[PDB]
A and B are shown apart, each in its own frame.
With several copies, the nearest count.
Chain A
Amino acid sequence: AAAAAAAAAAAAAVAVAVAVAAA
């Protein structure tokens, strides 16, 4: 007989950065 198996590895996220303006 056969059998199943579960697997959950990872995902992908998004970050936000701040910049500085010298006019």
Chain B
Amino acid sequence: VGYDDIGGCRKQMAQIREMVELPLRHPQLFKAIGIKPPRGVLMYGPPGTGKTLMARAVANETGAFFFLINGPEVMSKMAGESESNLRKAFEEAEKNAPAIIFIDEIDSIAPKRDKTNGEVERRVVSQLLTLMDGMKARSNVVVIAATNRPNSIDPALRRFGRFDREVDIGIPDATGRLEVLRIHTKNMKLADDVDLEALAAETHGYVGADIASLCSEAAMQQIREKMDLIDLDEDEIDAEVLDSLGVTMDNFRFALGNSNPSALRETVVESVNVTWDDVGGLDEIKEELKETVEYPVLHPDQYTKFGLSPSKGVLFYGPPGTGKTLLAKAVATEVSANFISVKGPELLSMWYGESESNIRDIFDKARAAAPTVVFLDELDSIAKARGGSLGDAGGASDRVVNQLLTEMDGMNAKKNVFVIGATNRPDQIDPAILRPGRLDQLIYVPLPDENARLSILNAQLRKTPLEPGLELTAIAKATQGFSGADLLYIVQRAAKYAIKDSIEAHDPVPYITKEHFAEAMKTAKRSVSDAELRRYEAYSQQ
């Protein structure tokens, strides 16, 4: 492992290389200017970005002495050995040659004083401080640290002379991810039809080890598609097939469609399968959503050419059972950006100040794996109007909405995050949310009309055997006031009658008959009420 293994962080790599190499390769410059170089690095960032890999690279390349210290491995049973261990380690490091020290998980042996108990922790922290910067502090020794939670470190350790340059090794961009993919696939034998440039673009939040996992999974799938076809050959491996190995593009696509970024492993959404053809009617809304979603991500050069950021938020409102969550499902299924589904009251908590910690966590997750689609379902619950309630519920339900206000439009770096809202009482959300910059465009999704409802029926029966002489237009012209869910129910009842007939006969009937479908239509429902549809109509008119 050398400096070429690590890719995607050329800036940070150079930032570390300068102080690790130039003082040891060309020290004439610093004596000519008469300033000693910085001596201390704190690599931070999300887990797996390549901090330990960068330490390994700088260790294997430089000819200087390298000493490894792990975090919890320094302290021992008896009182006064953690400090003795640190003393011996630093003495050995400085005894012989210019040396590099590397502390894995410095957060495990550098807790913030004034908030931790146990005297041994304080004593070892103080010993580390004295070793790194005290009287006769150091003599040509460099220290490197690696952590995932820099804020949980003693501020006395994050000072010049101890940790002066804190390099941020974070998630790569598209070019960095492309570089990571190309480096990881240098020894694995692939197929000529595999293109790395396209494959890197679909991945958005995959950082380092995530990409490695993708590669490994693809190879495993390729092994399991054809190894099973051939004899196991436990005695020996046939040479002819070994030269036939490779990885095809379909393997990479399959492995990609299963994997998710390691950051968003806890919030993984179940594999629900919907497609744009499965949503009938409301084509203009479909095209508008596609425009507002996939123009920012597929054509960012245009937006910077015009020098403007894109619009982000959308809110569907309308009568229940029309395709709001269905549109959310379709977006989640056939869009490159990551999806984080959240239910309405799912984020609220028993304790004080935890619903806001939950909101903070999910929105930081969204900003880390940008571009991302955050689908807030039933916004009418958490986004209640502030107004006046005079109660602890009012106090807690007012604090939660205020966190949402500052998270969507606050002090953030304009990262790509598209918020989709879905409510059924749009009059009961504070106007501070129904504003451009939070949810700019408010899409009303009425009940389907004759053409739209007919298209819905055609979409619903995509994979249903039907008689050649069936005329769905007639049932569509004799329906009024229905919703897509009601037509779905009609389809379900027709299928159930067909199944009843098939079981009674028991392929006696390889299709749904017009008689079965008429029997199903006999018990029409008309889910939504006309007494209550006027509320939506008045709200839209206003």
Contact = CB atoms under 8 A, between A and B. Distances in A.
Interface of A: 5-13, 15, 17-23
B118 A10 contact: yes
A19 B351 contact: yes
Given A8-B79, A10-B79, A21 B392 contact: yes
Nearest to A6: B79
Query: B-side binding surface: helix, strand, loop or mixed?
Result: loop
Given A6-B79, A9-B77, A9-B79, A17 B120 contact: no
Nearest to A17: B351
A12 to B, nearest CB: 8
Given A6-B79, A9-B77, A9-B79, A20 B351 contact: yes
Contact of A15 (B117, B120, B350, B393): B117
8 interchain residue pairs of minimum CB distance: A23-B392, A9-B79, A22-B352, A22-B393, A18-B352, A20-B352, A9-B78, A10-B118
Interface string B182-212: 0000000000000000000000000000000
A5 B348 CA distance: 52
Contacts of B351: 17-22
**Most B Cβ at <10 Å: residue of A7, A8, A10:** A10
A18 B395 CA distance: 15
Interface string B223-255: 000000000000000000000000000000000
B392 A20 contact: yes
Given A8-B119, A10-B118, A11-B118, A19 B350 contact: yes
Interface string B372-400: 00000000000000000001110110000
Contacts of B396: 20, 22-23
Nearest to A18: B352
Given A13-B117, A18-B351, A23 B79 contact: no
A17 B345 CA distance: 22
Contacts of B78: 5-7, 9-10
Given A8-B79, A9-B77, A10-B79, A23 B350 contact: yes
Interface in B110-131: 117-120
A21 B396 CA distance: 9
A22 B78 CA distance: 42
A13 to B, nearest CB: 6
8 contacts: A10-B119, A12-B77, A17-B351, A20-B396, A21-B392, A22-B350, A22-B395, A23-B396
Q: What range describes how many residues of B lie at the interface? A: 10 to 19
A8 B120 contact: yes
A17 B117 CA distance: 13
B392 A10 contact: no
**Most A Cβ at <10 Å: residue of B120, B352, B391:** B352
Interface in B51-101: 77-81
A10 B350 contact: no
Contacts of A8: 79, 119-120
A23 B77 contact: no
**Most A Cβ at <10 Å: residue of B81, B351, B353, B393:** B351
B79 A20 contact: no
Given A22-B392, A22-B393, A11 B350 contact: no
Contacts of A12: 77
A10 B350 CA distance: 31
Contacts of B81: 9
A13 B118 CA distance: 9
Interface string B392-418: 110110000000000000000000000
B118 A7 contact: no
Interface in B351-368: 351-353
Interface string B325-350: 00000000000000000000000011
Given A10-B77, A10-B119, A22-B352, 13 more contacts: A7-B78, A8-B120, A10-B79, A10-B118, A12-B77, A17-B351, A18-B351, A19-B352, A20-B392, A22-B392, A22-B393, A23-B350, A23-B393
B381 to A, nearest CB: 13
B130 to A, nearest CB: 21
A11 B80 CA distance: 14
A23 B118 contact: no
A20 B352 CA distance: 6
Given A6-B79, A9-B77, A10-B79, A21 B117 contact: no
Contacts of A22: 349-353, 391-393, 395-396
Contacts of B352: 18-22
Contacts of B79: 6-10
